[PDB]
C-alpha cells in the first residue's frame, strides 16, 4: 500500500575544506555521473528522491563553499538542517585536521543536535602512486581507515563512511545512511 504515501522532506547540508569533493559527491549521487570537466563551485537547488526502509524521502541537497561570498553566506545554509555530511579528503591530512579545528566547532555552533556523517572522500587515491609520492615529500601518507573512524568517534559523529566520487563507490550508501539519520 505504498502508492499515495506522503513523502518525508529532509534537508542535508554538506561542508568541508575546499576541493575535498563535496560538489562531485552531490553530482554523483544526484546524476550518477562523476563530473570530469566543468564542475561548478556549488551544485544548488537539487532535491533527491530516496527510499530507505519503506519511507519515501525528498532530500534537499545544500552545497557550500569557502571563499568570498560563499564564506560569509555559508552560515545561512544551516537553518532547519536535518543531517550534515562533513567531508575530508583521504589524500589530504590537512583537510582531516580541519575536521576538529574548524568544521566541527562551526557545525556544533549552528546545528547543535543535528547528526553528522563524517565522510572520507577520494579513497581511490589511497593507493595512487603519484599521491603517495607527493605526500611522502611531506612525511605524510593518505589517511588510513582507522584514522577516519577515530576522528568520527572523537567528534561524536553519527557514523564514518569512505567514498570515491570518482569511481562512485560508497556514494549511494553515504546518502542512504544520511537519510536514516535524518529520519530520527
Ligand atoms: N581522485 C578523485 N578526485 C576527486 C574525487 N572527488 C572529487 N575529486 C576531484 O577533486 C577536485 C574537487 O572537486 P569538488 O567536487 O570541486 O570539491 P569541493 O571543492 O569540495 O566541491 C576536482 O578536481 C574533482 O574532480 C574523488 O573521489 N577521487
Ligand atoms: Mg564545490
UniProtKB/Swiss-Prot annotation:
Changing residue 67 to L: Causes constitutive activation. It catalyses: GTP + H2O = GDP + phosphate + H(+). It is linked to Ectodermal dysplasia with facial dysmorphism and acral, ocular, and brain anomalies: A neuroectodermal syndrome characterized by linear hypopigmentation, alopecia, apparently asymptomatic leukoencephalopathy, and facial, ocular, dental and acral anomalies. Patients show no intellectual or neurologic impairment. Its cofactor is Mg(2+). One of its GO terms (biological process) is alpha-beta T cell lineage commitment. The gene is RHOA. It comes from Homo sapiens. Regulated by guanine nucleotide exchange factors (GEFs) which promote the exchange of bound GDP for free GTP, GTPase activating proteins (GAPs) which increase the GTP hydrolysis activity and GDP dissociation inhibitors which inhibit the dissociation of the nucleotide from the GTPase. Activated by GEFs such as ARHGEF2, ARHGEF3, ARHGEF28 and BCR. Inhibited by GAPs such as ARHGAP30. Inhibited by GDP dissociation inhibitors such as ARHGDIA. This is Transforming protein RhoA.
Amino acid at each position: 500500500y505504498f502508492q499515495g504515501m506522503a513523502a518525508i522532506r529532509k534537508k542535508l547540508v554538506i561542508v568541508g575544506d575546499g576541493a575535498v569533493g563535496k560538489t562531485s559527491l552531490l553530482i554523483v549521487f544526484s546524476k550518477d555521473q562523476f563530473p570530469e570537466v566543468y564542475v561548478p563551485t556549488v551544485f544548488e537547488n537539487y532535491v533527491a528522491d530516496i527510499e530507505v526502509d519503506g519511507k519515501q524521502v525528498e532530500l534537499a541537497l545544500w552545497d557550500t563553499a569557502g571563499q568570498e561570498d560563499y564564506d560569509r553566506l555559508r552560515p545561512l545554509s544551516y537553518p532547519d538542517t536535518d543531517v550534515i555530511l562533513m567531508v575530508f579528503s583521504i589524500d589530504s591530512p590537512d583537510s582531516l585536521e580541519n575536521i576538529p579545528e574548524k568544521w566541527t566547532p562551526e557545525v556544533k555552533h549552528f546545528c547543535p543536535n543535528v547528526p553528522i556523517i563524517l565522510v572520507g572522500n577520494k579513497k581511490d587515491l589511497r593507493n595512487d602512486e603519484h599521491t603517495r609520492r607527493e605526500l611522502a615529500k611531506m612525511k605524510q601518507e593518505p589517511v588510513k581507515p582507522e584514522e577516519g573512524r577515530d576522528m568520527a568517534n572523537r567528534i561524536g559523529a553519527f557514523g564514518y563512511m569512505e567514498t570515491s566520487a570518482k569511481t562512485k563507490d560508497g556514494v549511494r550508501e553515504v546518502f542512504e545512511m544520511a537519510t536514516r539519520a535524518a529520519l530520527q
